[PDB]
Design a protein around this nucleic acid. Sequence first.
DNA 1: TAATGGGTGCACT
DNA 2: AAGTGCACCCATT
Lengths: 120, 120
Amino acid sequence: LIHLDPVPSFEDRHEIKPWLQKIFYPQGIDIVIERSDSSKVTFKCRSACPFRIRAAYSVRLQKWNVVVMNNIHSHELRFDLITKTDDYKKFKENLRQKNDEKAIKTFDELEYKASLNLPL
Amino acid sequence: LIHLDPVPSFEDRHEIKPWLQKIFYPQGIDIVIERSDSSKVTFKCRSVACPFRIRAAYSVRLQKWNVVVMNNIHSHELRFDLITKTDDYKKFKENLRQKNDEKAIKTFDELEYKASLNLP
DNA sequence: TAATGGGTGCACT
DNA sequence: AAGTGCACCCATT
Ligand SMILES: [Zn+2]
Ligand SMILES: [Zn+2]
Ligand SMILES: [Zn+2]
């Protein structure tokens, strides 16, 4: 159980996924929304994996809490196959639109390394 | 396996549910969409597991929709009175008024009237 | 958005 | 009767 800290001051819950993607895409993890509402978003691996990420707003702390549950995946983590999905390409395009040069560089290198079949 | 006839000339998957509601609501059957795509819609009983299934499929060859009822057996009682208290029925009823479906409105008015009087 | 658990309709894929 | 991503819900404390 991992309590992420610190967490950005999200203005919209829809800022959460892209932020988690930057973190987990490099790990070869491809997160999707299992459930969401105004005050929570729960993530799992894209399709029987027990890996979970629970984001929920805390009134007491006036912030979003993000907790990582159960790191043990029931599958292989392969970043190479991830770069082919549509969610990844949109994530990548989003990075550019937000002019996140640092992240953009990180993923260009990751993609290049992957194209060389180097361990990830 | 029961084929329904006659079937109106639907021009969109989304026109099918409202038609099916007019037919099955009076039978104490509350249909929901299990799944849909541009050429197929699968319906079942709202979850309140029941095997009952309705499948509407578009024949490209015949350029018409065919509707079939499967597993006509239910795992639950069929109560119209309970149905009338749901949000989807109320929305269904308002849709009839929107469409100026005078005859349908009359029909369901009587069904509700009899329902309120505990009349079977 | 009390905190925290889960249900399920349904269109996308 | 495609499987599942996602969000509109509800339940219990
Ligand atoms: Zn939003
Ligand atoms: Zn996983
Ligand atoms: Zn049923």
